[PDB]
Amino acid sequence: LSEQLKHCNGILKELLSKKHAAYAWPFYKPVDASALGVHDYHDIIKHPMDLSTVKRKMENRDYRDAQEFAADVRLMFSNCYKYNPPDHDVVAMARKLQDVFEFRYAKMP
């Protein structure tokens, strides 16, 4: 991994760590639309994303730069903001995790 991608990997590890689990947990695995009963999810969200998918892409060296990584993490939050009402509990969690993400991403070497 490039130096910037190492920073990205560090951010990813932090997002998945116990420190943030109280608000990060919904983002750990792909949304299971059937399990959650959200039968319109895949009509509304054309490009699902979640932290396990970002992790697999990082491990496989799929991301060629920090910008590509950040686009995926941001897509994950955007999908949450698109599907859910802005006052929803999961949206509040998304905002908190995105704050953690954006502030550390801003510290890119």
Half-sphere exposure of 76 (CA within 13 A, CB side): 29
Q: Print the binding letters for residues 57-96 with ligand 9HW: x by CB under 6 A, - otherwise.
A: -----------------------x--xx----xx------
With the CA atoms of 21, 19, 47 and 72 taken in that order, what torsion angle do they form, in degrees rounded to the nearest 10? Answer: -170
Half-sphere exposure of 70 (CA within 13 A, CB side): 16
> How many residues contact ligand DQW, by CB under 6 A?
4
The CA distances from residue 37 to 33, 34, 41, 68, 101, in Å, are: 6, 5, 9, 31, 29
Q: Which of 17, 30, 99, 108 binds ligand DQW (CB under 6 A)?
A: 99
- Cβ closest to ligand DQW, residue 1 vs residue 108: 108
Does residue 33 belong to the site contacting Cl ion (CB under 5 A)? no
- Cβ closest to ligand 9HW, residue 6 vs residue 88: 88
Q: Can you give the binding site for ligand 9HW, defined by CB under 6 A?
A: 26-27, 31, 36, 38, 41, 80, 83-84, 89-90
